[PDB]
DNA sequence: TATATATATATATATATATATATATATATATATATATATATATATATATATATATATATATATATATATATATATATATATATA
């Protein structure tokens, strides 16, 4: 990037210096390609480690109260109540992806599940608290905290945190991953790095 | 005029050697068309759905990678203008 001088807030500025910058910005993004690649290389795998995590954590939670003796029409969870659930866990994915303290990833994700667990459990059978209670059991299983307690106080359900929450035990490198090709063909070691 | 040697034409029939046409049917060899169905081999179209492979569009959010715009201030890098 921005000016970084003054705001200026008018509008027809901001078009105008969009269309100044269209004749350059098609070719900063072909140069761009060389260092988006491998920063996707080593980025994907955080999100599909987290996904994967938490496929297994939930079915795990949910097997384990089917062996209680509960009926598998008591809960569904099956596309979407799981994506609000992948909601909240991405989110946290990225409060933590960032070097964040730990109230400060708890607080934020305490507002992601308020946001999401208004929007998507109204008229679909699921009250909140059993929500919250599958949500503090995941978290039991990742790190054991159970941090939000909830309520639904108003016509909304509302999530606040009791206590702070670490980032997710995931780290993602900084690699610059070679083919096995490229090592066998190889004749020394600073052929594959140079 | 008669005869031995060879090249072709006729006279009149019969025969061995091959090239094609008919007469009337039944075969064996192959190229294509129909009759009526059933089947194995592949090219595409529909009938109704469910699924594995990829190309893009949406439904509604939260993410990871990059191009630029703003929201509002403080920095680090450079181009010029001022204040004294």
Redesign the pocket.
Same mark, same amino acid.
Request: proline share 2%; aromatic share 14%; glycine share 2%.
């Given at each position: 990037?921005?000016?970084?001088?003054?705001?200026? %807030?008018?509008?027809l500025?901001?078009?105008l210096?969009?269309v100044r910058?269209?004749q /350059?910005?098609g070719d900063?993004?072909d *140069?761009?390609?060389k260092?988006?690649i491998?920063?996707?290389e080593?980025?994907?795998k955080?999100?599909h480690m987290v996904e994967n995590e938490f496929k297994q954590y939930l079915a795990n939670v949910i097997d384990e109260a089917i062996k209680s003796g509960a009926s598998p029409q008591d809960l569904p969870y099956v596309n979407?109540i799981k994506?609000a659930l992948?909601?909240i866990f991405?989110?946290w994915?990225?409060?933590s %992806?960032?070097k964040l303290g730990a109230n400060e990833i708890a607080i934020?994700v305490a507002g /992601?599940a308020t946001?999401?667990l208004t *929007?998507?459990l109204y008229g679909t059978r699921v009250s909140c608290e059993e929500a919250v209670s599958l949500i503090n059991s995941i978290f039991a299983v990742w790190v054991g905290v159970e941090p939000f307690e909830a309520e639904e106080r108003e016509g909304a359900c509302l999530v606040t945190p009791r206590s702070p929450l670490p980032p997710v035990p995931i780290s993602?490198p900084t690699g610059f991953s070679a083919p096995i090709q490229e090592v066998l063909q190889a004749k020394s070691p600073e052929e594959i790095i140079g």
């Open positions: 990037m921005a000016r970084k001088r003054t705001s200026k %807030n008018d509008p500025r901001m078009y210096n969009y910058k269209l /350059t910005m900063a993004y *140069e761009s390609a260092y988006r491998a920063n996707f080593n980025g994907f955080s999100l979407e994506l992948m909601k991405t989110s994915l990225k409060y %992806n960032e934020n /992601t946001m999401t *929007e998507n993602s």
